């Protein structure tokens with residue numbers, strides 16, 4: 001029947017945005033509601049959900065405003081359709097920073113953590129305690145003798161030091177110290193059980209302390225290392241603040257303790273980086289959606305700009321979205337090479353936030369950007385093509401499921417709050 005076919009496609013489209021809107025408002029309420037979920041990774045998801053919530057709001061408003069000059073001729077419709085096209089562009093750019101963040105998350109490690117904290121030295125320096133340090137936090141001997149410190153370093157590097165040591169020589173000795181730091185942990189009976197229970201991100205936080213203090217020094221935190229193994233982060237966080245290490249070096253401790261508490265690199269992140277993501281997700285769409293709106297209102301103004309068949313005014317909204325998808329598939333290919341490299345080299349497990357985030361972000365890129373690339377320069381079997389409306393409606397639900405409902409961290413917050421109710 002012609003009426004039943006046109007009516008059935010309306011149901012699967014409206015229940016699509018109904019299930020999406022609901023799940024996205026629930027998912028956003030979960031990320032804001034639970035205190036331990038307030039991290040950069042989840043704030044980026046909230047801005048992505050916001051673009052799918054406002055897209056659904058345009059869909060529900062268009063449907064509601066049909067209830068009584070026709071709606072196609074009204075200026076209010078054109079504003080709703082402009083707001084709709086702004087949300088579509090925002091979906092593809094909040095998906096872009098979603099891929100950008102993932103890539104930067106795979107690149108940051110212990111070698112970049114310690115390079116920020118320990119810094120870099122070109123010449124041998126007599127440190128405040130009495131030790132001679134050089135490169136990236138490489139101590140030699142406490143003996144007050146520069147002549148013996150240079151002869152000690154010469155045996156460690158190979159060639160004659162003289163004093164000045166290049167960038168490549170410091171990085172070579174820095175890899176040795178980190179390898180000497182992990183062997184110390186695994187050789188220690190009080191550090192190996194907590195290290196093997198910690199995730200790759202909080203493992204680096206434990207290595208960072210051994211790199212500054214030593215295997216026998218951090219082993220003294222018998223009260224703190226026990227509650228880290230028992231997965232009690234915040235109880236250990238306030239415990240490490242009441243230590244000799246926190247009053248000695250507070251700025252370094254604040255960054256290491258946050259990594260044990262949160263399990264992310266946010267204490268090594270810059271606040272202007274997130275300002276550059278909000279300028280990409282909401283700002284860049286605003287640069288090509290308003291000129292498209294201006295030229296469609298001043299020239300191709302006909303039924304909420306439905307008759308989109310005239311000139312290049314169609315490319316000034318499809319090429320910037322195509323560009324966002326081309327770069328998303330480039331990031332897609334590169335991240336897959338990084339993840340498979342880090343998994344085979346045993347530098348990553350399938351239980352880390354970087355691999356879990358890769359299982360969701362690398363799913364959505366060819367799920368939201370594949371259509372735009374296949375039908376790149378095509379404007380306009382009809383029953384089989386109308387099935388596109390179901391994937392455009394339930395894609396809001398899919399973003400909510402992959403970035404919240406399947407997340408292992410939110411499942412911990414529900415299981416923890418559930419136990420708090422009983423006890």
Ligand SMILES: CS(=O)(=O)c1cccc(NC(=O)N(Cc2ccc(C(=O)Nc3nnn[nH]3)cc2)c2ccc(C3CCCCC3)cc2)c1
Nearest residue numbers: 339355356357358359360362363402403404406407408409
């Ligand atoms: C090589 S790879 O393995 O790196 C990889 C690369 C690209 C895509 C995927 N696709 C994928 O793994 N799936 C299933 C799945 C399994 C686990 C999670 C998850 O636990 N996510 C999470 N946890 N915490 N936070 N986020 C999420 C998803 C997938 C596959 C296909 C679909 C569509 C099929 C058609 C219909 C619509 C869905 C959905 C998910 C893995």
